[PDB]
Amino acid sequence: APAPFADFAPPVRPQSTLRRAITAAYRRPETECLPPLVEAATQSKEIRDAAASTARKLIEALRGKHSGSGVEGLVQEYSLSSQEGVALMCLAEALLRIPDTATRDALIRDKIADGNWKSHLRSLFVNAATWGLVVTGKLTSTVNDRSLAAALTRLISRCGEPVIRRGVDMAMRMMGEQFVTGETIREALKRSKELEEKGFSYSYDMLGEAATTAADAERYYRDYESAIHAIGKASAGRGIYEGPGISIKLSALHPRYSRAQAARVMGELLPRVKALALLAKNYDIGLNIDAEEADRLELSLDLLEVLCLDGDLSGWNGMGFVVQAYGKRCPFVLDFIIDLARRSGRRIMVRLVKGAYWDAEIKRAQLDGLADFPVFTRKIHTDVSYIACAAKLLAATDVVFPQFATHNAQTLAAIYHMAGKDFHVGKYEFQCLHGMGEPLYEEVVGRGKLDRPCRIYAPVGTHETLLAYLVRRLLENGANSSFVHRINDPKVSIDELIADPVEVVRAMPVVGAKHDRIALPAELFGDARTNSAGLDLSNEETLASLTEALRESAAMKWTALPQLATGPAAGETRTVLNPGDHRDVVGSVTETSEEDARRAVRLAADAAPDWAAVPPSERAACLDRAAELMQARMPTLLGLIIREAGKSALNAIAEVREAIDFLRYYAEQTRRTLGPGHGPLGPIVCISPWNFPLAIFTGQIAAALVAGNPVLAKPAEETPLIAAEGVRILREAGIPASALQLLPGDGRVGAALVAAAETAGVMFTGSTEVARLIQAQLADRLSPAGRPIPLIAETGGQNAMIVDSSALAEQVVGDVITSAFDSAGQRCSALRVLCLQEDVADRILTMLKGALHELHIGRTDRLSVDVGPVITSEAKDNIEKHIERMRGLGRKVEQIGLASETGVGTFVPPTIIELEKLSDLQREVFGPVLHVIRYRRDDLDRLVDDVNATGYGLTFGLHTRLDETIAHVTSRIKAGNLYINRNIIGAVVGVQPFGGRGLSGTGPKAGGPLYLGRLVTTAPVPPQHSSVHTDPVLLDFAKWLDGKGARAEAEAARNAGSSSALGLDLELPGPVGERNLYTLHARGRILLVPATESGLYHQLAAALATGNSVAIDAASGLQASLKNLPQTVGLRVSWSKDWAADGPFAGALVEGDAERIRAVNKAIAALPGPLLLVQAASSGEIARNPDAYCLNWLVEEVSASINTAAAGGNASLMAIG
Ligand SMILES: Cc1cc2nc3c(=O)[nH]c(=O)nc-3n(C[C@H](O)[C@H](O)[C@H](O)COP(=O)(O)OP(=O)(O)OC[C@H]3O[C@@H](n4cnc5c(N)ncnc54)[C@H](O)[C@@H]3O)c2cc1C
Ligand SMILES: NC(=O)c1ccc[n+]([C@@H]2O[C@H](COP(=O)([O-])OP(=O)(O)OC[C@H]3O[C@@H](n4cnc5c(N)ncnc54)[C@H](O)[C@@H]3O)[C@@H](O)[C@H]2O)c1
């Protein structure tokens, strides 16, 4: 067997001194980056004055020829509102999808103008967010398609064919001549002659990036190759400076362009770039490598190095490379490139830009919990960085060819004067973007201006292809901080535009301070708690240190023992094997006898007073100390999780982060809530699943402990070692051994603990079928006070994602691959059923299957592994039996081929199964098996019914740009965690409180504010837990009670209406570019089992105040107590003689003495389907205690996470500069 982690993440090449200086700056604090840049960018007073004078002259010329835009003139002529202008351009876009010009004009004249555009023309408004930027300058992430439809009807009925004609002509010009230089490379070359005669040059961009499949990458390759021929033929020997060149993106040329797949990149991507470069060499044209995301920078340097040292490319100086001045590594990258140019003798063309992905870099660093950003956070810092790096490049013009890409007249003027009076073509150049920079550079190019050349970056492509690049440009043009936006702002003076960023930064009190309004990832939650920290698996220093820590973790002799209050106990011992390779022994577990499990509960009960007496603040301090210990131990914990549970490094990082976040969140919630009157339940049994073997394990135990309960921790039999280490950490943090006992073993140990007389509460996460067995055990039992033993049972899912024809296929496929196959589908949240609108299903399926075949399955101690094993041979057999049954029914089955190395472990290949109906699924299949169904748009409401009809309700995803569809689907779906335009596996503690309904859970949600209150006898009021809304049926019921003379019950009903938090609607703090919402809804239909009239009235008031309907036990004989109900109340009331026929219920309220409660609890447990959260009270308790039935457990929590950056950028951060 290969030694564990012996090949985890070896670098492409040994890191030179220059390469290590780059990596060292990756996330350097901003206050350290700026001082050396300020020093390097300093120019003399005489030059600063001359540059300000040049910049003013350029800006005065720009403002003096600035004319109104074509769209603005169109809006003016026809008095359009903003929505009308957007709707008009969407219509024009759709009309231009009709090729035959005469056919289009016939449709306009005889159909569109005459009225119902709906009857003749995929939503018309799929790209309205883009047109919104064009019309209004603002980015909206989703489209209000009902507003746009109304606006289009209004404008057509008001203005007729003439406005439609003007819109079509405007859109045809912008999409054919402004957003691109041409539709094809031949068209773009024909249009370039005019400005080349004026002294400009060109670099053509065949719009293309982020290949998803091998076929995508092949298509982009032959596009680049065909463009090089056309450009080279046109260049006709003009050479690399006067003649045109090409720009490429490495992400276009391989579907797995990432550091994790570096070996594939060097083996498969590099030869393709070399082949393109050889053709560019033969024509003697430039070939530029564009810069992309920050985690691709250093990888791209390995390709640049090999290409510049390759003798087959010698004699050609056209290789070019972009460096992004908004990045903290920029000057060190330039040092590396300048040295590479010296070593190779290649005069590398270096394009200095600021950078195009700023919003996304802020979001990514926050999501990943990294130390700092890889980009600056103040715009002026990027400006100083640019000028500092320009000074470095201008000192090296013998060795490199600097290309200064900017539309900022202040930046340009500073460099023009920095470069001085000696110039020749080939020394350096400026660059600009087509349709953006020509007004500025027509004041620069030419003997009559500044006599410096400019190369125009010219996008080339069809209307369809122009997508992502266009929104990046329009974001750029619209950002409050952008020069091209400020030049048009009449409130911004020329003196403000020519302000010298170098001197402004120098004069600030704290030079280089982070932006005040952008939180470091550690500070996402402010004073509430410290965010967990992750690890950057693109950082070579991190990979090197992690490799050592992982190897060291694999040499440790991990054990798990029955850790009773009195010390470790003896038992049956066996080895724990790596699921990816059974030859790899990870450790040993000693399992707990049923006798010792019962003994542990008795020890827990004897120790309960001593732990309850530890004040809540000190219990929370133990949790916070445990979190610090797990954070410090993360690399070792990663290694154990990788080998014991079959997790990849990325997934193990997320797992340890979640454990840290649980500890800190429950600690803070404790400090916000728990006081002397919130008494503990007593010994709590925590039974946890194998698949999140540290995070869910820790979360349940931490919550029970901090609420003052001693815990019996029973980890899954598959994953005892990481559980034992978590208990060791909690004990080191100060949790006494009597308060936290570890009982390894199988379900027999869990059952023995559940059944023990002193067990006062059970926290279960696992399969629905096991939860039902525990529900049956507990229905036999009552507390010493005669009440049900509280059970939190968080169970399985049958999770769907709905995708309509407005979604972006590339986004969908990435989120589907992650949601369905991450962790080999062994997430309770994993995507099980993908629902594709019929019109786009074939294209998305083709793309999905292509992405599937790029996944690497194997033992997870290699960074290049995407999908690990399933946990056991029994799990594998159960999953494969499902796949074969489906294959036997003739369903299409797509499967990855598995390498021979997988035979030593238990692997199932990622699988796509195309189904005909959702009813083709019976139970959760906990493996890498995605089911695909198709639907017609008009059947969307029925499809949501079908998703709800499974009885599950855990996670749910929707990909759409259309507000009407978002409103429709999210109001009708019944699931606990919703996700819009993102993956569906998010469970960030305190951000997406996690947990579902129906067959998926009882609640309350883990990682949410109602959780701790379930673990004490009297629940506290959670932070922010209130609602000003009163249920109207409750109000009608209270009036009916008063009319019947039941004055005390009517008062209790009004009080319940006020106390209810139904209607709570909050936004939770989290990362930028996401909205995370938390809401309280009705649970559904509550089963009422009353004994007395007053008890019935109290039960009904509690259920109605929380928005529920009820089914009342007809055997109570209390029908005559509810005569003459208002129709509003009657609609919510039914009577049930056969409870099993009238479900599923969403909870129950029971009145009676102890043996009546026990009898009813058994009858409720026998009902088919979901576990019911039952609350019971005696008649006397209802009389004495207004909170006899707690309203916390009669509402349902819903979490919704919306990716607001999905349209291609972040509107909120556009105002942050
Ligand atoms: C010809 C050409 C080629 C280009 N090629 C690439 C490329 O391959 N890869 C790439 O990533 N970019 C590239 N760019 C740059 C990018 O597309 C933008 O055009 C450029 O960043 C805008 O800078 P500016 O000097 O025109 O305008 P300015 O208004 O002076 O500067 C705007 C820039 O400031 C930065 N910024 C904004 N807010 C903040 C903030 N709060 N904190 C820190 N920085 C901030 C951003 O980089 C933003 O784009 C290219 C640009 C041109 C003209
Ligand atoms: N809703 C959530 O938040 C969530 C999270 C993770 C996993 N899950 C669900 O958990 C399942 C996968 O985890 P698993 O395979 O470890 O679940 P499982 O039901 O097989 O076992 C979970 C735990 O119950 C114990 N157990 C088994 N039989 C028992 C019995 N008769 N009495 C008492 N305890 C018994 C097991 O030993 C284990 O500790 C999946 O169905 C998944 O959907 C849900």
Ligand SMILES: O=C(O)[C@@H]1CCCS1
């Ligand atoms: O948005 C983009 O594509 C960047 C700007 C020009 C090339 S890289």
Ligand SMILES: [Mg+2]
């Ligand atoms: Mg099991």
